[PDB]
Design a binder for this molecule. Structure first.
Ligand code: FER
Ligand code: MG
Length: 322
């Protein structure tokens, strides 16, 4: 063992991405380097600091690898915010593929200082509340709701909710404390994060697109990568890129399915409310306003909003059809 790679994230060890991606990734790097690389996993922010501080922990070499949400740093990753727009995503797997290709095309300057192992998204975002069953747009009116990013929080406000921004690792405390009525998140880690018995009302939508997702990165310090010897850099490259994005997305999709099945079957308490095509169209109409406003503001910013939105949408459809 010549080099140690400390990987730091904010999820519990029992989270599916830890059990089914990071542990086998560790196994692969340690086997394929013939023990010359060790990977050490640190869940639950166990090397210190705040979820939003994680990106800089890697970029600045306090740790070697982080897993984080780009939207936790408001304004930092403007081109990545395209993947926060309403009804843009499909599956974790397909949208993660689209995110990685999109980021390799458009986000080279945005990600300078990290080697991206995977640029991906989570599985379909859904609405979770403590008490209020969301059966219509009217039911979310005045609910204190948490989203991952300023653009998802903007959609929540437009839908008539009162968004309160914070990292998801802060939601359990805030719900129990009465700050939040609910949160948007995928189902995949809802059991590992212990939210399932607190937010027991869940709402999902009709049709071939999800309410929202958000862009996530497995990012290694560009200095740690660059400092590896020429025969070990390729062990990382062989366990990096679009195929890793797909793999993370697919693990989330699979964990979502197990979790949704467990609620539908009565094995775990809670209700899944499926909004039909007519009700869903009302949410998509609000969503269209967010898309239009974001493209407009991107133009005054000096970003080509329409071009990034068209390439993101094109890539989602391509990887969904495939
Ligand atoms: C607990 O659900 C999840 C949330 C996120 C995103 C972060 C956020 O919403 O702040 C990613 C994966 C999850 O399993
Ligand atoms: Mg660095």
């Amino acid at each position: 063992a010549e080099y140690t790679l400390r990987l730091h994230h904010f999820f519990p060890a029992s989270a599916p991405v830890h059990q089914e991606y990071f542990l086998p990734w560790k196994e692969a790097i340690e086997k394929e380097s013939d023990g010359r690389l060790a990977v050490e996993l640190y869940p639950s922010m166990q090397l210190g600091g705040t979820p939003p501080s994680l990106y800089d922990q890697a970029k600045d070499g306090q740790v070697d690898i982080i897993w984080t949400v780009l939207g936790y740093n408001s304004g930092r990753f403007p081109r990545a915010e395209v993947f926060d727009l309403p009804f843009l995503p499909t599956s974790g797997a397909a949208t993660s593929q689209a995110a990685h290709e999109y980021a390799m095309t458009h986000m080279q300057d945005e990600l300078e200082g990290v080697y991206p192992i995977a640029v991906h998204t989570h599985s379909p975002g859904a609405l979770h509340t403590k008490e209020t069953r969301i059966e219509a747009l009217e039911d979310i009116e005045g609910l204190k709701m948490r989203g991952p990013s300023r653009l998802v929080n903007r959609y929540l406000a437009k839908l008539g909710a009162e968004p309160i921004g914070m990292p998801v690792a802060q939601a359990l405390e805030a719900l129990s404390r009465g700050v939040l009525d609910g949160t948007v998140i995928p189902f995949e880690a809802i059991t590992a994060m212990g939210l399932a018995d607190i937010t027991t009302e869940h709402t999902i939508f009709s049709g071939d697109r999800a309410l929202y997702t958000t862009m996530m990165i497995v990012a290694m310090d560009q200095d740690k990568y660059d400092a590896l010897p020429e025969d070990l850099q390729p062990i990382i490259d062989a366990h990096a890129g679009g195929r890793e994005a797909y793999r993370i997305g697919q693990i989330m999709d699979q964990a979502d399915h197990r979790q949704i099945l467990a609620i539908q079957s009565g094995e775990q308490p809670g209700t899944i409310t499926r909004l039909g095509s007519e009700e869903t169209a009302r949410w998509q109409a609000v969503g269209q306003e967010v898309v239009d406003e974001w493209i407009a503001e991107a133009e005054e910013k000096g970003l080509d909003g329409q071009m990034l939105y068209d390439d993101a949408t094109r890539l989602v459809e391509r990887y969904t059809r495939a």
